[PDB]
Amino acid sequence: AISLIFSLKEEVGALAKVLRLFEENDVNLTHIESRPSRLKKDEYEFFTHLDKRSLPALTNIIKILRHDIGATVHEL
Amino acid sequence: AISLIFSLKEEVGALAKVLRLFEENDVNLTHIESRPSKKDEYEFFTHLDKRSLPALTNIIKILRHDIGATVHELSR
Ligand SMILES: N[C@@H](Cc1ccccc1)C(=O)O
Ligand SMILES: N[C@@H](Cc1ccccc1)C(=O)O
């Protein structure tokens, strides 16, 4: 499984923006879970699985999340 | 915190559409977790902050009758 972790600044629609970006890149989730960040009081972390057909978008959505959104992101 | 548990039909952008509804109603999540369900669906466990309460009747309307999700639980 493709595993991706990212951290977002807390606000309404924070996750929705990420998922819109995923959808627009034909990325499809098989798992999501959140937890409050232990590092920053104003951040939430998200652990996701993506299906294998999402692989061609993977390098690129990582860069977009970091660049367009300012998320901290890591492929696991 | 408001507990809301619902299923969606599996498709690219399934969750994005729901989170757009939430966002447009000023609903803020504090937790999300998915699980595969019904073979072609996913179940979502969410918590909404108390400030989301004025939105509940509208998001339930749209979730049930527009998006066509099944709501398994709503509790506060
Ligand atoms: N595969 C769907 C539903 C889904 C979302 C998140 C986790 C698991 C399933 C999507 O990407 O929107
Ligand atoms: N509160 C933010 C981030 C978040 C999403 C989902 C779960 C937890 C936190 C939002 O509603 O988008």
Numbering used by the authors:
A (entry chain A): 34 to 109
B (entry chain C): 34 to 70, 73 to 111
How do the authors describe this structure?
Phenylalanine hydroxylase (PAH; EC 1.14.16.1) catalyzes the first step of l-phenylalanine (Phe) degradation via its hydroxylation to l-tyrosine, and serves to metabolize excess Phe in the diet. Like other AAAHs, PAH adopts a multi-domain architecture comprised of an N-terminal regulatory domain (RD, ~100 aa), a central catalytic domain (CD, ~300 aa) and a C-terminal multimerization helix (MH, ~40 aa). PAH-RD contains an ACT (Aspartate kinase, Chorismate mutase and TyrA) fold commonly found in enzymes for binding small molecule ligands.
In this study, we have determined the high resolution crystal structure of human PAH-RD bound with Phe. The structure of hPAH-RD is a homodimer, with two βαββαβ folds (one from each protomer) arranged side-by-side to form a continuous 8-stranded β-sheet, resulting in an internal 2-fold symmetry. The dimer interface is largely polar in nature, comprising main-chain/side-chain hydrogen bonds contributed from two amino acid regions Glu43-Leu48 and Asn61-Ser67, as well as from a bound Phe ligand. Omit Fo-Fc electron density map revealed two Phe molecules bound to the hPAH-RD homodimer, at the interface of the two βαββαβ folds along the plane of the 2-fold axis (inset). Each Phe binding site comprises residues from both protomers, including the ‘ExVxAL’ (aa 43–48) and ‘YxF’ (aa 77–79) sequence regions of one protomer, and the ‘NLTIxS’ (aa 61–67) region of the other. Significant Cα differences (RMSD >2 Å) between the two structures are found, and regions that undergo most conformational changes in the presence of Phe include: (i) loop L1 and the first turn of helix α1 (aa 42–49), which brings in residues of the ‘ExVxAL’ motif for Phe binding, and (ii) the segment (aa 59–75) containing loop L2, strand β2 and loop L3, which is displaced outwards to ‘open up’ the Phe-binding site. The key finding of our study is that the binding of Phe to PAH-RD restructures the ACT fold, forming the necessary inter-subunit dimer interface and the resultant Phe allosteric site. To reconcile the difference with the recently reported rat PAH full-length structure, which did not reveal ACT:ACT interactions in the unliganded form12, we propose that the rat full-length PAH structure in the absence of Phe and our human PAH-RD structure in the presence of Phe could represent the unliganded ‘active-site blocking mode’ and the Phe-bound ‘multimerization mode’ of the domain, respectively.
